[PDB]
Design a protein around this ligand. Structure first.
Ligand SMILES: *[C@@H]1O[C@H](CO)[C@@H](O)[C@H](O)[C@H]1NC(C)=O
Ligand SMILES: *[C@@H]1O[C@H](CO)[C@@H](O)[C@H](O)[C@H]1NC(C)=O
Ligand SMILES: *[C@@H]1O[C@H](CO)[C@@H](O)[C@H](O)[C@H]1NC(C)=O
Lengths: 213, 216, 216
C-alpha cells in the first residue's frame, strides 16, 4: 500500500490568508492525487484531481500542484467557508489510500480558559460511581492541558477528555475532563483538584473542592 | 440532480454482518464505479472497495477481502456493501462515492452523506442524567448524561429557551462500552437565585426522556 | 458521476482533435489514437482537404479554447483513406492518419484498444461517444451514453440509405469521433461517427483486416 502523509496535521489561518497543505506519498504516484474537503459530520467534497485540476464548481482559489511523491494544496484567499479538514488521495495503484487529513482552523487571539470544577452529584453517588467534571470554557488555542490531583496525587488512566469544535461566534474551544472513580475510592480522599495548563495562563490554574463540603 | 442517498445508521454486535445501501439517481448508474469508503473516528479515511454496476466487476481492499461483498441492483440503481464477521474496530461512517470518470474508478467526485455503523456487544440502555450543580461574574451549569447506548443523545436547555453559552461535548465511549456526554452552559451567577434551568435529554433509541433541574 | 456530459482530464485519453489552420484555426473532426503514430478517424473529414500540410492534430486535450500557438500538435505524415470510400457516398467512411512523430503515452494520451476480428457479432451495452460537437463548438470535451441498435431495427428509419453490416447505429458528437464500449472490463473502439434519426457509425470490427494491414 502507498502511504500518504499530510503536513501539518492542523493549521490555523485567517480569512484572506494564503495557506498551503502538503501531502507526501511513500511511493511515486505520478500525478494521480486528488484532494477532498470535509466539514464536521458531512461527506467529503471533491476539490482536485490529477493533482492540479479543479473539480466541478470548485472556486478558483483552490490550487493543486506537485508530482512524484510530493503534492501541495494551496488556497489563495481563505473564505470562512474554507475552514475544514482536507484529505489527499492517491489512485495510482490499488488499494486507494488517503492522508490522515489536515484541519484548517480559524486563527484567534489567545484566550485563557475559565475553569470550573463540579463535585459528583448525590444521585450518582447512590449508584456506586463518582464523576467529577472539570470544565474549560472558551479558550484558544486548543492545546490546553488538564491534570487531576487527588490529595495532591496525580491521577492517570481514569480520566477522559472531550473538546468541542470552534465556536461559530468567538472561534474559541471548550474542553471537559471527567475523572471517574468508584464510590469506595471516591470517599477515600478529601481534596479533588483540576489543574489546567494553557498558553494563555501565566501559571497553571487549579480549581479544587473538599469532598462533602 | 445527482444524488447518493445511503441507508440509516446501524447498530450491530460482534460477529454479525451489516448491509449498507446507496441509492443513486440523476446519472448513468451502470457506467460509473461505485466506491465504498469508511471513516473510523480515529483512523481517517479507508477505501473498502468498488463495483462497476454495468459488468458487476469489483475490486476490494486486501484488508477487507473475505469480509466485504459489494453488490448492485441495476433495477433500483442501488449499490450495497455487506461487511461480515463484524468487529468493534469496524465502527465507522461508511460512505458510497461515485467515480469522477466513466473509464476509471478514482477519484470520487461525489459522496453519500455516510452511514454510521456501530459494532458493540453492549445493549440498548437509557441515559442516567446527573446535574453539574454550580458552585458559589458568570457561573457554569451542566448536565452529565452518562451510561447510554447507542448514540446519539440530544440535550437542550429549557426546551430551547437557553441556547447562548451552551456547550454539548461529543460523547466518549467508556470502558463499560456505554457512551457518556456532558452539556454545560454559563449564566450570570446572580440569575441562579431567580431562574430555574432544566436539562432536557432525549434518547430516541431507548425512547427515554429525562428533564433534570440544575440548582446549587 | 457529476458534470453530466462534461468530460474530465484523462477520462478519454484516446480522444484527439483534428484541426486545419487556413486563416483561423478551427476544430473540424475528432479521432481515436490507436497507436503511437496512428490515428483512426472518418474519411469524409478530408473531402476537399487532401493536403497533409494544413492538418494539426491535438492529443491529451480537453478544452479546445485552451489551444494556443504554443500548444503542441501532431502533423499528418500519411492519410490512408479506405480505397473503397467515395466522396459521394458514406460507405466505407474509415481513414487512417499516420503522425510524423510518435506520441508518448501519458495520463492524458493513451491508445484505445481495437476490437478483435471475432467481435463483429458481439453486443455492447455500455457505449459512449465523445466529441466537441455543435449545438459553435463546445469548449469542453463532451460525453454521451447512447445505446446501440441492431442493423435490422435501424434500417426502418434511414429508409433513404442502405445500412450495411459494416455500420453501427445508436440513439455532442464529432465527425470521426470515437464510439467506445466497455466489454469484459476493457474499453474498445467499436465505431467511428460518420453521419453525426439515429447516429450511424462505421463498424471498426469489420475493418480490422484493413487497419492491421495498413498499420503494419
Ligand atoms: C458543463 O460545462 C459548461 C461550461 O462550459 C457549463 O455551462 C455546464 O453547466 C456544464 N454542465 C454540467 C452538467 O455540469
Ligand atoms: C476553457 O478555456 C478557456 C480559455 O482558454 C476558459 O475561459 C474556459 O473557462 C475553459 N473552460 C472551462 C469549462 O472553464
Ligand atoms: C517523448 O518521447 C520521446 C521519444 O521517445 C522522448 O525522447 C521524450 O523524452 C519523451 N518525453 C517528452 C516529454 O518528450
Amino acid at each position: 500500500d502507498i502511504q500518504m502523509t499530510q503536513s501539518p496535521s492542523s493549521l490555523s489561518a485567517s480569512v484572506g490568508d494564503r495557506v498551503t497543505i502538503t501531502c507526501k506519498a511513500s511511493q511515486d504516484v505520478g500525478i494521480a492525487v486528488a484532494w477532498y474537503q470535509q466539514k464536521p459530520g458531512k461527506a467529503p467534497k471533491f476539490l482536485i484531481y490529477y493533482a492540479s485540476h479543479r473539480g466541478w464548481g470548485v472556486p478558483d482559489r483552490f490550487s493543486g500542484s506537485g508530482s512524484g511523491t510530493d503534492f501541495t494544496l494551496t488556497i489563495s484567499s481563505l473564505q470562512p467557508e474554507d475552514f475544514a479538514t482536507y484529505f489527499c488521495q492517491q489512485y495510482r495503484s490499488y488499494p486507494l489510500t488517503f492522508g490522515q487529513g489536515t484541519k484548517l482552523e480559524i486563527k484567534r487571539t489567545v484566550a485563557a480558559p475559565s475553569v470550573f470544577i463540579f463535585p459528583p452529584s448525590d444521585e450518582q453517588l447512590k449508584s456506586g460511581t463518582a464523576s467529577v467534571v472539570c470544565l474549560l470554557n472558551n479558550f484558544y488555542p486548543r492545546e490546553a492541558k488538564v491534570q487531576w490531583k487527588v490529595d495532591n496525587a496525580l491521577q492517570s488512566g481514569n480520566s477522559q477528555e472531550s473538546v468541542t469544535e470552534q465556536d461559530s461566534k468567538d472561534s474559541t474551544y471548550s474542553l471537559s475532563s471527567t475523572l471517574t472513580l468508584s464510590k469506595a475510592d471516591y470517599e477515600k480522599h478529601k481534596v479533588y483538584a483540576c489543574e489546567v495548563t494553557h498558553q494563555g495562563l501565566s501559571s497553571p490554574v487549579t480549581k479544587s473542592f473538599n469532598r462533602g463540603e | 440532480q445527482v444524488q447518493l442517498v445511503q441507508s440509516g445508521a446501524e447498530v450491530k454486535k460482534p460477529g454479525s454482518s451489516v448491509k449498507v445501501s446507496c441509492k443513486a439517481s440523476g446519472y448513468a448508474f451502470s457506467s460509473y464505479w461505485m466506491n465504498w469508503v469508511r471513516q473510523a473516528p480515529g483512523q481517517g479515511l479507508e477505501w473498502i472497495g468498488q463495483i462497476y454496476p454495468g459488468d458487476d466487476d469489483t475490486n476490494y481492499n486486501a484488508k477487507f477481502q473475505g469480509r466485504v461483498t459489494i453488490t448492485v441492483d441495476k433495477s433500483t440503481t442501488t449499490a450495497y456493501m455487506e461487511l461480515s464477521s463484524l468487529r468493534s474496530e469496524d465502527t465507522a461512517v461508511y460512505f458510497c462515492a461515485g467515480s469522477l470518470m466513466v473509464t476509471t474508478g478514482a477519484p470520487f467526485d461525489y459522496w453519500g452523506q455516510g452511514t454510521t455503523v456501530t459494532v458493540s456487544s453492549a445493549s440498548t440502555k437509557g441515559p442516567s442524567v446527573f446535574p453539574l450543580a454550580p458552585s458559589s461574574g458568570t457561573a457554569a451549569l451542566g448536565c452529565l448524561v452518562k451510561d447510554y447506548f447507542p448514540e446519539p443523545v440530544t440535550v437542550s436547555w429549557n426546551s430551547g429557551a437557553l441556547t447562548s453559552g451552551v456547550h454539548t461535548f461529543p460523547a466518549v465511549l467508556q470502558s463499560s462500552g456505554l457512551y457518556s456526554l456532558s452539556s454545560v452552559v454559563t449564566v450570570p451567577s446572580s440569575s441562579l437565585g431567580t431562574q430555574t434551568y432544566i436539562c432536557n435529554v432525549n434518547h430516541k433509541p431507548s425512547n427515554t426522556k429525562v428533564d433534570k433541574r440544575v440548582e446549587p | 458521476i457529476v458534470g453530466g456530459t462534461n468530460s474530465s482530464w484523462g477520462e478519454w485519453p484516446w480522444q484527439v482533435s483534428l484541426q486545419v489552420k487556413l486563416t483561423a484555426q478551427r476544430h473540424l473532426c475528432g479521432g481515436s489514437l490507436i497507436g503511437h503514430q496512428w490515428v483512426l478517424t472518418a474519411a469524409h473529414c478530408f473531402d476537399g482537404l487532401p493536403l497533409q500540410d494544413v492538418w494539426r492534430i491535438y492529443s491529451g486535450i480537453l478544452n479546445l479554447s485552451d489551444i494556443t500557438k504554443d500548444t503542441p500538435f501532431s502533423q499528418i505524415k500519411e492519410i490512408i483513406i479506405h480505397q473503397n470510400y467515395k466522396v459521394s457516398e458514406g460507405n466505407h467512411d474509415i481513414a487512417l492518419i499516420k503522425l510524423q512523430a510518435p506520441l508518448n503515452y501519458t495520463e492524458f494520451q493513451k491508445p484505445i484498444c481495437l476490437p478483435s476480428k471475432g467481435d463483429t457479432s458481439t453486443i455492447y451495452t455500455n457505449c459512449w461517444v465523445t466529441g466537441w460537437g455543435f449545438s459553435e463548438i463546445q469548449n469542453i470535451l463532451q460525453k454521451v451514453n447512447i445505446p446501440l441498435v441492431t442493423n435490422e431495427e435501424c434500417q426502418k428509419r434511414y429508409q433513404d440509405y442502405k445500412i450495411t453490416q459494416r455500420m453501427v447505429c445508436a440513439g455532442k458528437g464529432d465527425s470521426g469521433g470515437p464510439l467506445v464500449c466497455k466489454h469484459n472490463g476493457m474499453w474498445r473502439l467499436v465505431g467511428i461517427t460518420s453521419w453525426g434519426q439515429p447516429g450511424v457509425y462505421t463498424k471498426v470490427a469489420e475493418y480490422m483486416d484493413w487497419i492491421l494491414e495498413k498499420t503494419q
